[PDB]
Design a binder for this molecule. Structure first.
Ligand code: JBQ
Ligand code: JBQ
Lengths: 212, 207
């Protein structure tokens, strides 16, 4: 079943852990992590350089990424490039990728990878540039972990959730809502619906088609 | 000064996030195993949901004890949850100036609501989601939050368009010549148009 390759200059940060949702799956999926510097040939193992046209920071070189993806990818590969400028990664995306035979995730710095890498790959395989949110990360590594977790839990083998409770029924003078103790499946369903409504309207009005 | 305490039943997951000079006292991250605060020999952290339904809910007595020991009145308690307010860059900026963050990592189904409600009577509590996809638990979200916050700690809109570096020609593709023109006003305008087109294509919501 599914193969996931992750390419990064911080392979220890990805390093698959038994005691993980992904770790259990590994013990249905195979996850391999590759050090990008493996495909460098200068003594300094240089993966980036200053941007053409100017600007702050560095851009990852196309040469190294090309050699790396040449080796790892096939025409059947779905190449995932986490980036702040990507299409939104959503739950629909997770379901779609959950049926893929082979995901390769290219982790780069925020400033990004030379655009020609994605352009070149697209001539040979499917390429998806995606953002997991509008906060700013220093690199794609944490995004890769999020994507893997969201995808792996869907592999064979709307409205916000309201508040949940468990035992004891009273705790620090705070009681569980009595309807939840009443065993009335209908009243419980109605209460839960109303709680989710209040919470969605308050926290995520966008989900119900309202202004933010 | 910034102290981050993370509480999780997967402490090894959180160890990875090295990172810089704590020797200057700018940033300390401590990860705590939630099972430290369990009451029974089976080290139980969750229980069946009241009112029925699938999954488990994390126990209030365990989390209550953990937060009692870890938190103070000055703490900003962060609770990652799919039902949370959106975590944004503005949020990250605000939290970057906090003396003490405690991140309570729970499973998707959640922590008994009384835990957060109780904590909010003596400290600031923030329930947040990092996105509208489903994770099994809050650990990955904590990593995302920790990264977005700490890079704004010193010493630790439109989409950006394509970027390029050497060599000028690679596998049949040349860098856009405008970028080599030495006309920096034109370069800015070109980049603005690239940004416009990419935003329209990928994130029309931003407009
Ligand atoms: O999805 C993101 N959101 C914010 N920053 C990033 C930096 C690198 C990769 C990536 F996917 C992201
Ligand atoms: O499923 C999620 N989606 C977004 N944020 C989260 C934060 C904590 C736990 C969790 F499951 C999630």
């Amino acid at each position: 079943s599914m193969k996931i390759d992750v390419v990064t200059i911080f392979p220890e940060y990805l390093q698959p852990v038994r005691q993980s949702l992904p770790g259990k799956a590994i013990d249905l999926v195979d996850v391999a992590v590759h050090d990008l510097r493996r495909w460098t040939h200068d003594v300094h193992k240089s993966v980036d350089d200053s941007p053409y046209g100017g600007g702050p920071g560095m851009v990852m070189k196309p040469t190294v990424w090309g050699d790396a993806l040449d080796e790892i990818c096939t025409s059947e590969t779905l190449l995932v490039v986490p980036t702040p400028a990507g299409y939104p990664f959503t739950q629909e995306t997770a379901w779609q990728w959950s049926t893929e035979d082979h995901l390769v995730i290219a982790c780069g710095r925020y400033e990004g990878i030379d655009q020609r890498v994605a352009d070149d790959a697209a001539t040979r395989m499917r390429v998806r540039e995606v953002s997991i949110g509008d906060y700013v990360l220093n690199g794609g590594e944490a995004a890769a972990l999020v994507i893997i977790e969201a995808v792996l839990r869907l592999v064979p083998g709307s409205l916000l959730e309201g508040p949940s409770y468990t035992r004891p029924p009273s705790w620090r003078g705070m009681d569980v809502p009595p309807v939840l103790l009443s065993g009335d499946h209908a009243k419980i369903a109605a209460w839960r619906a109303e709680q989710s409504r209040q919470r969605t309207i308050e926290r995520r009005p966008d989900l119900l088609g309202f202004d933010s």
